[PDB]
Write a protein that binds this ligand. Structure first.
Ligand SMILES: N[C@@H](CCC(=O)N[C@@H](CS)C(=O)NCC(=O)O)C(=O)O
Ligand SMILES: N[C@@H](CCC(=O)N[C@@H](CS)C(=O)NCC(=O)O)C(=O)O
Ligand SMILES: [Cl-]
Lengths: 208, 186
């Protein structure tokens, strides 16, 4: 295959990978996975990603990769001229700290809104977990504001892989009952991101 | 390097990587892990710390030079960070996401099922064998080792997972694992 194929769903974390591919100036083929019919849970998609999640990335040799953070580092690795990962190990580690925080904590908090059935069986448990999301996401936003976002981007002046990842997650905040406006650095960050060519490109492709 | 860790937690995976890289470090017992650099920079998140260790000791070969294999390694690491450790965390840290005692009982009761499902995925789709990438050790391996160590306690019988069993046996034989055991890290 000449180009990368990205399996994605609008409004999901898969969009972070699309943003990175756009920043890398690489051609790619987006494939929409339709949550409205639970396409991600069906045999055809499970043959692509047995975990039943987006994103998944199909490489030129048909290898399938999964996990947003891994795909972001992959894009950087195949497009070094985009400068998406700092050469300084400390700065790159701060970039990855932000990414793993999003993967392990902030996305996970968001996931308890609609995917409570991953960890519980009772309806009352789902209602309990759903009710806590505005508070858990606000606490995550607090940490982003104080300990992740140097400003304007995660690493400060320099855009990096942490930024598309953070952007897509922070895009969930209003919908999760958290005012992004209450966080000045997050607000400035979202304004810079919204103005970038990569983000305009994915919007034009119907991803946001 | 100063590493803040707690025995029997995921922070130990970082110590294992530092041992593999043959870097000197001062373990400080206490989230962990946290890594204090000489300029007093504090770095956090296991997966980020693992890549940091490989970045400062490139001759250790802890990350494949092939970007595909490196992405497969990181896929395993993010899976552990986002799914398997998370599933485990609902056993005793359910209060992160719920308030009602009935929700905690529900969560507790699912842990053997969620952890077994993760073990199934590890066995079939992460662990090529003997290590994550096959014959070649990588950053994914210390991460997987510490997480798989929780399986028995979470109600999952590892004996029924032959690749996980082989993997744990190979890890136990490594100098890095013997070293963190010698330091009381577990
Ligand atoms: N740890 C995974 C999370 C992937 C994930 O959960 N994606 C969501 C959308 S944001 C999904 O596919 N949900 C489908 C479902 O749970 O059925 C990653 O970072 O790639
Ligand atoms: N996303 C973090 C998770 C760190 C974490 O949760 N560590 C646990 C031990 S495995 C902890 O420190 N828990 C403290 C607490 O819950 O009180 C990472 O992978 O580094
Ligand atoms: Cl700066």
């Amino acid at each position: 295959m000449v180009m990368l194929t990205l399996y994605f769903t609008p409004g999901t974390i898969s969009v972070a990978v699309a943003i990175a591919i756009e920043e890398a100036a690489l051609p790619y083929q987006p494939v929409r996975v339709d949550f409205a019919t639970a396409e991600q849970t069906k045999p055809d998609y499970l043959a692509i990603n047995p975990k039943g999640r987006v994103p998944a990335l199909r490489l030129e040799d048909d290898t399938i990769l999964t996990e947003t953070g891994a795909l972001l580092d992959y894009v950087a690795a195949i497009a070094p001229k985009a400068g998406l990962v700092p050469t300084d190990p400390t700065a790159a580690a701060q970039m990855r700290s932000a990414m793993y925080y999003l993967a392990s904590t902030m996305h996970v908090a968001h996931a308890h809104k609609m995917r409570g059935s991953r960890w519980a069986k009772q309806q009352s448990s789902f209602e309990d977990m759903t009710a806590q999301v505005p508070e858990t996401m606000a606490a995550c936003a607090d940490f982003v504001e104080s300990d992740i976002l140097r400003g304007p981007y995660v690493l400060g002046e320099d855009f990096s892989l942490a930024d598309p990842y953070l952007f897509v997650v922070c895009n969930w905040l209003d919908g999760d009952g958290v005012d992004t406006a209450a966080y000045p650095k997050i607000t400035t960050f979202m304004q810079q991101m919204t103005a970038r060519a990569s983000v305009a490109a994915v919007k034009d492709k119907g991803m946001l």
